[PDB]
Amino acid sequence: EEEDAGLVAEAEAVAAGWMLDFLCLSLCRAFRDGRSEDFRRTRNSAEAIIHGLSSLTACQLRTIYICQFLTRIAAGKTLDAQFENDERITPLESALMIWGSIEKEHDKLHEEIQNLIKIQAIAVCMENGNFKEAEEVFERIFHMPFKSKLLMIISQKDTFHSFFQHFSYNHMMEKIKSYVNYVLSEKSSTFLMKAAAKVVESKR
Amino acid sequence: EEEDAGLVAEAEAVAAGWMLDFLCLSLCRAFRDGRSEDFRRTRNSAEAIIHGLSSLTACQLRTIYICQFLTRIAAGKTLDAQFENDERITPLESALMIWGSIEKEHDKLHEEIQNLIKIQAIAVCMENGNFKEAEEVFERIFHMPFKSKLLMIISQKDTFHSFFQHFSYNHMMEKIKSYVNYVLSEKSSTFLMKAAAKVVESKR
Ligand SMILES: COc1cc(COc2ccc(S(=O)(=O)O)c3ccccc23)cc(OC)c1
Ligand SMILES: COc1cc(COc2ccc(S(=O)(=O)O)c3ccccc23)cc(OC)c1
Ligand SMILES: [Ca+2]
Ligand SMILES: [Ca+2]
């Protein structure tokens, strides 16, 4: 009669999976809408739920990587945040590692977001006056003409450069929001959200 | 067309309610089984989910109070834990306040658990050698003959007293576990657990 505790542990693993998918959808939607405090509170919930899980499918792992990517991007201007065991890695550099690791299609939007994160990883350093740090970020990350324009900007110490204006933080955020909209379309059919939406719809 | 964001916020509130009921059931079951680390990880999850909730029904509030009560009881021997804004209140004193506030039937088991928490609030102090603290705990909490036996034990500084053995920490834990078993029976029918159990049962 010890099988009952096994069947309970299995059911809690099924419920945690549904809770994880739901909290990713909620986290993605909060990032898209600019709801900063809801993103902060939902990220805390997703991390806690994840610590209570032992087995993860490939889809659940991809889902977690997307949440980690959005968390780092949000923290992109927070140079005091240490997301990696190596304490020199800045938040935008950390988001770049995850963006190159996710098992996803490498379409034009993928490469545009990647290139925007690389320009901004340097620019944010420039903006805070950490010129030597921008040079170090440049070396860890690094097209050949694209590469030489950035090195010229770091050496010239011109933090407020027109190149950065052209491929702005806002530009990087809007492109990332377009991608999040495709993830939101894919996850809107998860079990928790679907059953919650039906309850709301039945009271209308 | 701003109604869609309202319907989303409503559905997330419905899903959070189901997640809360599920995490209480999981937390109660972990306490009953002696699964200390699962209790610790599930408590973290319940607190996070609760911070993402604005409206609470009376049932949800009762449910949260039971989780807070079990958390304090588990931490009953941790005299370094400060659960209240008043820093002098010990964990067992804090569990006593919640046990007297929950809207529940005051049956014989209720009063037995209450009386066991009062004896142990003092005993744990005694056991660590904080005699003046046990006297202070005694004054904040305090039957007339029952009251005088305890004061005699604090004054005599006899930490290893036979009275404490008779109404032991283990005794208090077992009685609290009987109560938790009735809560587990009531909550086993919540939506998340019920739908998770069906999925596990359909794969058998
Ligand atoms: C492979 O995924 C994980 C996830 C965790 C715990 O979940 C998280 C940890 C850290 C972050 S953050 O990006 O650093 O803020 C998360 C962000 C969003 C969602 C979950 C996060 C742990 C783990 O290994 C210990 C692996
Ligand atoms: C009325 O219930 C709440 C709950 C919270 C947040 O949830 C929790 C806070 C603290 C504890 S603990 O007992 O101190 O560890 C919890 C334990 C179990 C479950 C939830 C807990 C906050 C709140 O007001 C801010 C009111
Ligand atoms: Ca730094
Ligand atoms: Ca203390």
**Which ligand sits closest to the CA of A70?**
1
Among B100, B93, B151, smallest CA distance to B118 is for: B93
B146 and B163 Cβ atoms separated by less than 8 Å: no
Any A CB within 8 A of B9 CB:
no
Question: A7-25 in b/e burial notation, b at 16+ Cβ within 10 A?
Answer: ebebbbebbbbbbbbbbbb
Long-range Cβ contact pairs of B143-151 (< 8 A, separation 24 or more): B146/B115, B150/B119, B150/B122
CA–centroid distance, B74 to ligand 4, in Å, is 16
Residue at token pair 């989780």 = B67
CA torsion A200-A62-B30-B86 (nearest 10°) is -80
The rounded Å distance from CA B93 to ligand 1 centre is 36
DSSP B120-141: HHHHHHHHTT-HHHHHHHHHHH
Q: Which two tokens stand for residue B153?
A: 């034990």
Give CA–CA dist B81/B4, Å, rounded: 44
- Distance from C-alpha of B106 to C-alpha of B110, rounded to nearest angstrom: 5
Task: Choose the closest CB to A45 out of B10, B52, B195.
Answer: B52
Distances (CA, A) of B63 to A83, B29, B56, B148: 36, 14, 10, 36
**CB spacing of A200 vs B29 below 8 angstroms:** no
Dist. CA A58–CA B81, nearest whole Å? 40
**CB of B154 closer than 8 Å to CB of B127:** no
Best of A41, A66, A71 to mutate for ligand 1, by most ligand atoms within 8 A of CB? A71
Report the C-alpha gap between A5 and B33 in whole angstroms.
10
Place of tokens 């306490």: B31
Residue owning tokens 């889809």: A59
> Which residues 6+ apart lie within 8 Å of A127 measured at CB?
A159, A160
Which atom of ligand 2 is the closest one to the Cα of B72?
13
B14-35 burial, b if ≥16 CB within 10 A, otherwise e?
bbbbbbbbbbbbbbbbbbbeeb
Residue B8 contacts A, CB cutoff 8 Å: yes
Between CA B6 and CA A197 the distance in angstroms is 11
Amino acid at B51: H
Do A7 and B200 contact (CB within 8 A), yes or no? Answer: yes
Query: Would you give the DSSP letter of residue B104?
Result: -
Name the DSSP class of B75: T
Task: Retrieve residue A119's tokens.
Answer: 């320009």
* Residue of A65, A177, A68, A199 lying closest to B16 (CA atoms): A199
Find the ligand nearest to B125 CA: 4
Please identify, by atom number, the ligand 1 atom nearest to the C-alpha of residue A24.
Answer: 19
Residues with CB under 6 A from ligand 2: B 43, 46-47, 50, 64, 67-68, 71-72, 83
Residues B3-202, CATH architecture:
Alpha Horseshoe (1.25)
B44 shares contact with chain A (CB less than 8 Å): yes
For residue B12, give the amino acid letter: E
Distance CA B94, CA B17 (A): 26
Task: Measure the CA–CA gap between B156 and B172, rounded to whole angstroms.
Answer: 24
How is residue B87 annotated by DSSP?
Answer: T
The closest CB to that of A11, out of B38, B48, B193, belongs to: B193
What is the CATH superfamily name and number for domain A3-198?
Telomere repeat-binding factor, dimerisation domain (1.25.40.210)
What is the torsional sign of CA B88, B89, B91, B92?
positive
Pinpoint the alpha helices (H) of chain A. 3-33, 36-51, 58-74, 91-101, 108-127, 131-141, 144-155, 162-166, 169-187, 191-202
Atom 12 of ligand 2, residue of closest alpha carbon: B68
Resolution in A: 2.1
Q: If we measure between CA atoms, which residue out of B149, B200, B63, B49 comes closest to residue A43?
A: B49
CB under 8 A, 24+ apart: contacts of A37-42: A38/B52, A39/A70, A39/A74, A41/B48, A41/B51, A41/B52, A42/B52
Q: Name the token pair of B119.
A: 């004896």
Measured distance CA(A16)–CA(B41) in Å, rounded: 12
Q: Is A9 on the interface with B (CB under 8 A)?
A: no
Which A positions 174-193 lie with beta carbon below 8 A of chain B?
Answer: 191-193
Cα B64 to averaged position of ligand 2 atoms, centre (Å): 7
